[PDB]
Amino acid sequence: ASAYQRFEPRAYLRNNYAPPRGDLCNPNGVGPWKLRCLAQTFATGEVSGRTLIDIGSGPTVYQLLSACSHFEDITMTDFLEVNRQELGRWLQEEPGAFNWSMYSQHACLIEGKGECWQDKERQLRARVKRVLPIDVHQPQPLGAGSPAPLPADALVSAFCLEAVSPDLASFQRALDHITTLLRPGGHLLLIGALEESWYLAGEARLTVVPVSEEEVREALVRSGYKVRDLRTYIMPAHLQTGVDDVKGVFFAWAQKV
Numbered sequence: 001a002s003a004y005q006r007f008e009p010r011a012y013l014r015n016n017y018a019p020p021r022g023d024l025c026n027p028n029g030v031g032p033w034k035l036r037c038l039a040q041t042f043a044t045g046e047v048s049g050r051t052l053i054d055i056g057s058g059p060t061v062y063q064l065l066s067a068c069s070h071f072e073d074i075t076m077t078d079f080l081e082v083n084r085q086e087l088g089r090w091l092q093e094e095p096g097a098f099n100w101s102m103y104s105q106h107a108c109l110i111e112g113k114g115e116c117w118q119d120k121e122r123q124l125r126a127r128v129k130r131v132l133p134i135d136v137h138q139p140q141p142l143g144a145g146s147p148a149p150l151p152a153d154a155l156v157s158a159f160c161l162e163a164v165s166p167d168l169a170s171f172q173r174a175l176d177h178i179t180t181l182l183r184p185g186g187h188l189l190l191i192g193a194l195e196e197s198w199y200l201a202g203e204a205r206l207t208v209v210p211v212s213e214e215e216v217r218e219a220l221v222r223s224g225y226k227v228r229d230l231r232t233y234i235m236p237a238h239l240q241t242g243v244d245d246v247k248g249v250f251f252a253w254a255q256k257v
């Protein structure tokens, strides 16, 4: 976890959200697939409410695109200052912010409601009230008196848990921890890597717990969830780039019962 102190956001983003992986043009790529999972899931309109929290946002927003048109109060979080600062930059349209425009576009394309992407971003920025520090290893991961209206009506988290946890049980506790933030009857949309064990981000070389679809399911159940959907994307050769050793990406829609 002290490895995360050398974590370089610009190199993360570059490694994982710029082309090839960041070229949204081929619909068989991983970005289109993630974006579509979120989109489909919300267009069901069974995931709805007033507040929502992004767990381990790091320096990224795509995970909230389709989401943001359904929850008026959206809280973002990450363990690192540097990331909370990089999010700041895009939220406030400051100089040198990252360019998500491609992602916004495709969310708009995928949702098919004829929305322009500036309207979409405009809505996201507007609905993101706060960026908060977070440690999922803590049993109240946000702290005590957090500005975050609890309990949240829903949780979103991508590539965090399995990437902050040294092992399967550790991963499992973290899940219990965040689940604490989620109002009962509420919804969790979880996206992560499958059987990934390391991934780079500049100088920082991070270790990952290689989980599996079955492990992830059991884990969601153990933590008190009803699994409404679990889907798997197998990484194609040409998206294997040596910034990691990820084999697939998984997406899960789970309802706390």
Ligand SMILES: Nc1ncnc2c1ncn2[C@@H]1O[C@H](CSCC[C@H](N)C(=O)O)[C@@H](O)[C@H]1O
Pocket (backbone or CB within 6 Å): 001, 004, 007, 055, 056, 057, 058, 059, 060, 063, 078, 079, 080, 083, 134, 135, 136, 137, 157, 158, 159, 160, 163, 164
């Ligand atoms: N103990 C911890 N608790 C919560 N987040 C942590 C953490 N330790 C590291 N992190 C954060 O977990 C993030 C993993 S990278 C994930 C970024 C983004 N959600 C995506 O879809 O790409 C990093 O931003 C990192 O800072």
Ligand SMILES: NC[C@H](O)c1cccc(C(F)(F)F)c1
Pocket (backbone or CB within 6 Å): 016, 021, 030, 159, 163, 193, 196, 199, 200, 235, 243, 244, 246, 248, 249
């Ligand atoms: N967990 C970090 C990992 O390198 C990662 C982040 C985002 C996307 C992807 C991938 F493209 F699915 F491999 C991997």
